[PDB]
Design a protein around this ligand. Structure first.
Ligand code: HEM
Ligand SMILES: NCCc1c[nH]c2ccccc12
Length: 347
């Protein structure tokens, strides 16, 4: 899917994107606005295939975010953008704005890579979500298959092992950020390109790491329908319709059903506890421990860049939360590791 979108240049902006970091560095807003005006007049978006509309949203969204970076609402300044983005989102059935999908897996590798700035630290955000997202999508489909297998079936253990290995891509992705993105450069140079944009009477947050579908893993795997009034369920609720449409039913079904681990805690204290059953209960613990290998260093990274020393003009991520939200998801995940460890303790 992604290589078919990353290869596209539907708005002929390849040469423009090799100038964009210098345009942004010199605050050349007139060339940004002019490029947005040329686009609405040069192109009939109703004629676009789905793949073209996804890549077009990627490219147009990034010029929009460069204008919003300066403090200007780009659709209030180029009012013809509105029906253009309207038309694009009817084709994508997605928000009229770029997300981490467009910035990561749909963003081409190499010389055509779309970047806001010349800073090498920006490569650490892009590669982070470009690595994490396909792996999480694989784990989503594998974890979804566990509701329908028995703890005693070896196919359960091997599928949950496949999921843990795929979730590791999120660890590989955040480790690329930690080693490439300076916290101070992030807050001062990159973070401003991810601010909300008003489009047809609604505000759309900018691309954000939290838009990788890790929360979909969580809802199916451990959260389920067990904490209705949580702030995490509020963030997931706000996130559903940012996901690719392909992922929305899994998320909605899982928010309305018991989680895998809740329903596997029942099976465990109800069936004959064999050796493969314990392997099955331990394959769930392994997956949870991989999310911790992502969430613990992620928390340290966000703490360092949101410190009084490094934070710049922001106290929040692009989704509007402080690191307390990250602490809250991390404590949830630790509580679940502790829960599985107790169920396994006699064995
Ligand atoms: C310097 C870089 C980064 C900083 C300062 C940062 C900070 C934050 C903040 C403040 C939040 C709270 C939600 C919000 O308000 O947007 C958040 C959420 C989140 N971000 Fe990051 N982030 C960074 C890079 C990344 C990267 C590269 C990824 C993916 C590879 C990522 C994945 C996530 C996830 C999954 C969440 C949801 C919470 C969770 O599931 O644990 N972040 N991040
Ligand atoms: N995880 C949210 C931090 C963030 C803000 N802008 C980004 C761009 C790419 C990756 C992460 C971010």
């Amino acid at each position: 899917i992604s290589n078919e979108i990353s290869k596209l240049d539907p708005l002929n902006l390849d040469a423009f994107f090799n100038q964009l970091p210098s345009l942004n560095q010199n605050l050349e807003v007139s060339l940004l606005i002019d490029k947005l005006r040329e686009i609405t007049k040069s192109y009939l978006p109703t004629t676009f295939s789905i793949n073209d509309a996804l890549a077009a949203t990627r490219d147009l969204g990034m010029i929009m975010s460069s204008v919003r970076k300066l403090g200007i609402q780009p659709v209030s300044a180029v009012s013809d953008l509105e029906v253009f983005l309207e038309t694009l989102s009817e084709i994508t059935n997605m928000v009229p704005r770029e997300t981490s999908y467009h910035y990561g897996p749909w963003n081409p590798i190499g010389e055509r890579e779309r970047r806001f700035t010349h800073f090498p630290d920006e490569r650490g955000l892009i590669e982070g979500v470009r690595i994490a997202i396909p792996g999480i999508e694989l784990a989503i489909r594998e974890i979804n298959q566990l509701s329908n297998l028995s703890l005693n079936d070896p196919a359960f253990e091997s599928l949950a092992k496949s999921a843990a290995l795929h979730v590791y891509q999120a660890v590989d992705g955040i480790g690329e950020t930690i080693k490439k993105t300076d916290p101070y450069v992030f807050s001062h140079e990159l973070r401003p390109f991810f601010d909300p944009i008003r489009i047809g009477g609604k505000s759309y947050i900018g691309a954000g790491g939290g838009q990788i579908p890790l929360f979909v893993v969580d809802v199916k795997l451990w959260l389920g329908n067990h904490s209705p009034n949580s702030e995490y369920v509020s963030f997931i609720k706000d996130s559903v319709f940012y996901l690719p449409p392909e992922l929305r039913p899994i998320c909605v079904d899982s928010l309305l059903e018991p989680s895998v681990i809740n329903q596997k805690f029942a099976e465990f204290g109800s069936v004959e506890i064999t050796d493969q059953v314990i392997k099955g209960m331990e394959s769930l613990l392994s997956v949870i421990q991989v999310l911790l290998k992502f969430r613990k260093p992620h928390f340290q990274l966000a703490q360092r860049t949101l410190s009084k020393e490094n934070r710049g003009n922001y106290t929040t991520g692009s989704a509007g939360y402080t690191n307390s939200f990250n602490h809250m998801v991390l404590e949830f995940t630790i509580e679940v590791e502790k829960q599985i460890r107790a169920v396994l303790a006699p064995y």
